[PDB]
Design a protein around this ligand. Structure first.
Ligand SMILES: *[C@@H]1O[C@H](CO)[C@@H](O[C@@H]2O[C@H](CO)[C@@H](O)[C@H](O)[C@H]2NC(C)=O)[C@H](O)[C@H]1NC(C)=O
Ligand code: NAG
Ligand code: NAG
Ligand code: NAG
Ligand code: NAG
Ligand code: NAG
Ligand code: NAG
Lengths: 50, 214, 296, 49
């Protein structure tokens, strides 16, 4: 379940970090990166509690 | 001469699959959904004088058993798909875009779909010497070419065979060590089917399984 | 972690140029009522023509930064061109409501591309008014993304029959722009071009101007293929793909096998980032010699 | 709206098709009689005598 959670978009443009990096700009890349961080961090929280 | 004769009937038996993408997989159980032919569905078997204008639904399944290449092309501005001894003809006009490819007992199958303004062609040549009802052997229809015309199509006319209709369903394609489709199981047919679908395995043991909500 | 040393590129194989002069610099353009669409494939686009040369009036790219445009290969480029009033320019926006966005070509919310516009002084204007250009005004229902309407039936209001039965509460849905040189700047005709494309959905067809490099093996380096990028050791493979298959995945649906558009061979991808440090010590008080350990 | 018994029926700034649907605060009306040469004079952006 952890590994499969990676492919989840989590309400962003895409899922691949490298792909998002190429097509975006550092001034406003914060949105997608921040959303991905929040989602994956929450997933880790659940897994660690289990 | 244009004769008349009442249509016949026959049933599909686990036939018709195609790779949903161009990607390779090996010995996995990847699940996907698309417009497929549901298992055990009525197939309007047309036996030949007869050539009505068939209503081109979202997705069809054209398959002829065996002839002497009497069938040449199909009908779909209007798409002109037809084959001669010379280069296969691909044209788009109201004949009474253009393209050619190359100069040109068994069983042949063809599926036609139109998504994102794209006309995909999946086909497979299978040497089979069976009887009126086609046998039960799993095989896929590899892509051949994707010519985009992006037009409005509602009718198709042929130029002994079968036709069917596709529906949006979710499947489960088993992959071998060489990455070839060998087995397919649905999960919109029978309770066992959705059990197999949700457990993501081809064998189920004794017990109770939660599947979905009513 | 192991650090990569070099980078390799096996990206392009095309040489033709993308037809663009007729797309932008020309003068014959269809009305916003009926917007033309063009198919572009098997060529290379140039931002230097768009970004650098001239300035026009609009360079609003949505979804992808313009500065990185001609750096990622696309699939199935579609171009749309039409002319509208300068006052109507703002209505062309992702998800923004507007009369043209309600009854005419409406931009999808998730559109990923760019829009370029510029004013027309008298190129598409007449002293008496350019009545050839028309814009939809009246419609029973709103439109869906990438749709066109061709019916010129007289709009129906109320219970009075229309759409051929001319009479009360019946009006023609199409109005003439009437562009004139004497008109205001906001009312002057603007030449706007809409371009759209798709990413990582199909084999490469329209790639950037960047050329390829040599091909190294047995050392994890940055690699790019048609847009896909990653880091890992590249080596030959034994698995045989279908003649059409290009990518390669695993149980995790992660890229691990690629086809070089030049060599046309099965290439393996293996992870190169790995390692963890464990340090065992006999104690600060006792001595100082240490023995590092690498976990995996 | 469906009476169709008027020589002039138009809503300026609002949609007459959808008027029985949204709530306002106050409603006011002025009524008078004019000639046939003065019908277009009473209009937004219209002037004259
Ligand atoms: C996948 O391909 C391999 C290689 O062709 C098949 O293994 C056999 O390999 C020998 C090589 O000496 C061939 O002579 C045989 O013909 C191959 N077997 C078959 C059935 O073709 C392997 O069988 C293939 N996998 C499947 C499921 O057919
Ligand atoms: C196929 O059609 C016939 C008559 O149209 C019908 O009796 C039969 O039940 C159909 N097949 C299935 C599986 O329902
Ligand atoms: C086959 O038909 C095509 C259709 O245009 C034609 O161009 C070609 O010459 C034909 N060849 C023969 C041998 O009849
Ligand atoms: C396709 O053509 C049919 C018949 O003319 C029409 O009813 C339908 O609305 C058309 N659809 C599109 C998307 O053009
Ligand atoms: C394209 O690939 C072929 C075969 O790999 C090679 O001979 C040719 O030089 C390549 N050209 C470009 C522009 O990459
Ligand atoms: C024609 O178009 C090209 C690119 O589309 C542009 O570089 C050139 O300046 C144009 N010619 C003009 C504006 O005369
Ligand atoms: C180190 O260990 C020895 C004996 O175990 C003790 O006598 C000495 O005080 C220790 N020194 C420190 C700095 O802990």
């Amino acid at each position: 379940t952890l590994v499969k959670q990676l492919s989840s978009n989590f309400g962003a443009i895409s899922s691949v970090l490298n792909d998002i990096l190429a097509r975006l700009d550092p001034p406003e890349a914060e949105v997608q990166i921040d959303r991905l961080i929040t989602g994956r961090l929450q997933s880790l929280q659940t897994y660690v509690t289990q | 001469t244009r004769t008349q004769l009442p249509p016949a009937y026959t049933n599909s038996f686990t036939r018709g699959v195609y790779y949903p993408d161009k990607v390779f997989r090996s010995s996995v159980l990847h699940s996907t959904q698309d417009l497929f032919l549901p298992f055990f569905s009525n197939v309007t078997w047309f036996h030949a004088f007869d050539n009505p204008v068939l209503p081109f639904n979202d997705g069809v399944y054209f398959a002829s058993t065996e002839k002497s290449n009497i069938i040449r092309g199909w009908i779909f501005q209007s798409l002109l798909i037809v084959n001669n001894a010379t280069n296969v003809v691909i044209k788009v006009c109201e004949f009474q875009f253009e393209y050619v490819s190359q100069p040109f007992k068994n069983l042949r199958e063809f599926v036609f779909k139109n998504i994102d303004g794209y006309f995909k062609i999946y086909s497979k040549h299978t040497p089979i010497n069976l009887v009126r009802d086609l046998p039960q052997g799993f095989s896929a229809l590899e892509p051949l070419v994707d010519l985009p015309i992006g037009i409005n199509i509602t009718r198709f006319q042929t130029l002994a065979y079968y036709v069917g209709y596709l529906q949006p369903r979710t499947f489960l394609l088993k992959y071998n060590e060489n990455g070839t489709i060998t087995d397919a199981v649905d999960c919109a047919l029978d309770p066992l089917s959705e059990t197999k679908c949700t457990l993501k395995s081809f064998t189920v043991e004794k017990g109770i399984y939660q599947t979905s909500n009513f | 972690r192991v650090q990569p040393t070099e980078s390799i590129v096996r990206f392009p194989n095309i040489t033709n140029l993308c037809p663009f002069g007729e797309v932008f610099n020309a003068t014959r353009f269809a009305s916003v009522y009926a917007w033309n669409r063009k198919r572009i494939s098997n060529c290379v686009a140039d931002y230097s023509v768009l970004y650098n040369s001239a300035s026009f009036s609009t360079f609003k790219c949505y979804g992808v930064s313009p500065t990185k445009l001609n750096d990622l290969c696309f699939t199935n480029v579609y171009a749309d061109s039409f002319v509208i009033r300068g006052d109507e320019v703002r209505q062309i926006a992702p998800g923004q409501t507007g009369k043209i966005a309600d009854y005419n070509y409406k931009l999808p919310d998730d559109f990923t591309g760019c829009v370029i516009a510029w004013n027309s002084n008298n190129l598409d204007s007449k002293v008496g008014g350019n009545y050839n250009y028309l814009y939809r005004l009246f419609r029973k229902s709103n439109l869906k993304p990438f749709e066109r309407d061709i019916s010129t039936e007289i709009y129906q209001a109320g219970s009075t029959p229309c759409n051929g039965v001319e009479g009360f509460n019946c009006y023609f849905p199409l109005q003439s722009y009437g562009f004139q040189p004497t008109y205001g700047v906001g009312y002057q005709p603007y030449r706007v071009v809409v371009l759209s494309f798709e990413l990582l959905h199909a084999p490469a067809t329209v790639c950037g101007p960047k050329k390829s490099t040599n091909l190294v093996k047995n050392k994890c380096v940055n690699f790019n293929f048609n847009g896909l990028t990653g880091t890992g050791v590249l080596t030959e493979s034994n698995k045989k793909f279908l003649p059409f298959q290009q990518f390669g995945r695993d149980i995790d649906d992660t890229t691990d096998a690629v086809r070089d558009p030049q060599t046309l061979e099965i290439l393996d991808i293996t992870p190169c980032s790995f390692g963890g440090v464990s340090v065992i010590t006999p104690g600060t008080n006792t001595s100082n010699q240490v023995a590092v350990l690498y976990q995996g």
